[PDB]
Design a protein around this ligand. Structure first.
Ligand SMILES: [Cl-]
Lengths: 51, 37, 79
């Protein structure tokens, strides 16, 4: 049930929580210029900006 | 019990080995809690 | 060439999988685990017909022979 957007009780799951965070927090801050994708590290890494 | 075990599992995470790394670069232990006297 | 190529990608693998929190904690303790310097082997690995003294050399084939032997030695060692 945790793999669904809502569990059987209509409650948020870890799937919905993480989905929201990666978009509204991590990816949003990439667009704000504080984070960059490092194909060298196969990961997103914080940039040395004033953040 | 789960809370207790989650703590024991957290102690196995790599982050806790930082000290050991530094002490060897320039120069307890999980399981001890199970050693019953 | 084959020797440093295998070592380069083995280090890359070990670096990619090394716990991130541990890295930061080692840094904060003046024991930074240094990142692997990036390199440029792709073009060499793509050479399929090197013209030398009239011969056509498949550099890719030769490297694979060595790298394959390195993979087996790594596995043999781990076990
Ligand atoms: Cl570099």
């Amino acid at each position: 049930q945790q793999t669904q957007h809502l569990d059987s009780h209509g409650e948020p799951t870890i799937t919905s929580l993480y989905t929201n965070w990666y978009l509204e927090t991590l990816l949003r801050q990439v667009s704000n210029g504080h984070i960059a994708y490092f194909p060298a590290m196969k990961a997103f890494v914080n940039l040395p900006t004033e953040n | 019990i789960c809370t207790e075990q989650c703590t024991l599992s957290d102690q196995l995470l790599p982050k806790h080995c930082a000290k050991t790394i530094s002490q060897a670069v320039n120069k307890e232990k999980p399981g001890v809690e199970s050693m019953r006297k | 060439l084959a020797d440093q190529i295998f070592a380069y990608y083995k280090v890359m693998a070990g670096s990619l999988l090394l716990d991130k929190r541990l890295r930061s904690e080692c840094k904060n303790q003046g024991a930074t685990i240094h990142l692997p310097p990036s390199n440029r082997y792709e073009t060499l690995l793509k050479q399929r017909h090197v013209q030398l003294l009239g011969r056509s050399i498949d550099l890719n084939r030769l490297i694979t022979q060595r790298v394959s032997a390195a993979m087996y030695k790594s596995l043999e060692l781990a076990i």
